Structure 1
């Protein structure tokens, strides 16, 4: 019931970046990504997270997954899924070059649906593929698309077949997990869902939390450090 407080000193650091100045100021740079204040702005107010923010955030979850006790994580980039549902395996099999997807516990798959964002999570321990939409929607297909992707992928690289024995594909209910109230906070919900999920915590927060999360997210990215 208790969330890392943002001190007045942290508070100030956020102000200094949400401020007018060159939309090139290079605020942060990591995982081949570069957050400028242009990008950082999409977290301001009720704006709409751009891809840079989201890609950066999932990477910090990936980074965080190294420290032991946590399940390991691969985060697919945000153009992986939309360039699958549209063009199929041969487009993407190349992106996984020098990467073993089975060596980790969890894969995160940010899904860009038009102007909306949701998420899919593969969990090898639970042998399940789950879909999260803070608009309570569904995508029984997206999950099939991913299991199909796994089969195909074990084929290429491991030359083996992937054992789908006991795997379960579902969309999270829309109940229990909390839902958005603001169309722009969809990027946040996908981020925060992924955060809880990668720490194996229950999803605890609500919509009332999102202005706290955004400012926090700004701080975290500036410091490349997750509270």
Structure 2
């Protein structure tokens, strides 16, 4: 027996996610954050923390996106896995977006893949500014499957661009470089999920506009923000539990 604490967003809203007491259990120190907690908070950030602009210019996939994109006739390898998640963008063109976030969990470890400026063809710059189509990898440590992830996304984009734009664009290692900006690293084991959430939160509070390598984000956020984050999230869930009860 489990108790559903909240449904976020709560109805009348439509895309509601349920969060139970068992889900809260993973908020304990030394516990890996599960899918439900990751997707919940990311939804919360998009609905309560991102500026209207950032919301329109961004799209966040649930953790099931990459999972489904990788698991198993005339189709090639690239278009076989894309068929598995072709529905996730039925009513949304991702090439109109500046940022597309993809939560990734490999071997219980969480890391983030952020596709940036997919509409740019190459690197642009002017007052020094710099942007380019690319894939950022934000990891509180380092994952072994990263390159496999980056290659799957480039191939995901090729198919998706061919399905929507009806043309051929080549998303390659040089075409759309993958970068690992230097961000704060994990201190405690089991905390990669907490870092993933903090990354998106910090990204929304202060987006990455300059892509001049190397991207320095070593002090992106204070260390104490991470220290209290698991608890802050638990308090948020219970705070909403009482709100969805008060009505």
What band does the TM-score fall into relative to the shorter chain?
A: 0.7 to 0.9
Q: Is the 8 Å Cα contact of residues 119 and 133 (structure 1) preserved in structure 2?
A: yes
2:69 maps to 1:84: yes
Aligned length: 200
Instruction: State the structure with more CA Rg.
Output: 2
Q: Is the 8 Å Cα contact of residues 178 and 205 (structure 1) preserved in structure 2?
A: no
Give the CA deviation at 1:151: 1.3
SS in 1 for 2:142: coil
Give the CA deviation at 1:33: 0.4
Distance 1:155 1:127 in 2: 17
- 1:141 is matched with which residue: 148, 169, 178? 148
Distance 1:135 1:26 in 2: 32
Matches within 5 A, 1:23-102: 23-30=2-9, 31-63=15-47, 64-65=49-50, 67-68=52-53, 72-87=57-72, 88-102=81-95
Q: Is the 8 Å Cα contact of residues 117 and 190 (structure 1) preserved in structure 2?
A: yes
User: 1:205 — aligned with what?
Assistant: 222
Flag the 1:96–1:69 CA change in 2: closer, same or farther, 3 A: closer
Distance 2:236 2:115 in 1: 25
Q: Is the 8 Å Cα contact of residues 39 and 53 (structure 1) preserved in structure 2?
A: yes
TM value normalised by structure 1: 0.75
Distance 1:160 1:132 in 2: 31
TM value normalised by structure 2: 0.70
Unaligned runs of 5+ in 2: 10-14, 73-80, 118-130, 209-216, 241-247
User: 1:172 — aligned with what?
Assistant: 180
Deviations 1:40-94 (A, max 9, x none): 2211333221100101122223334452366722111112112223352111112
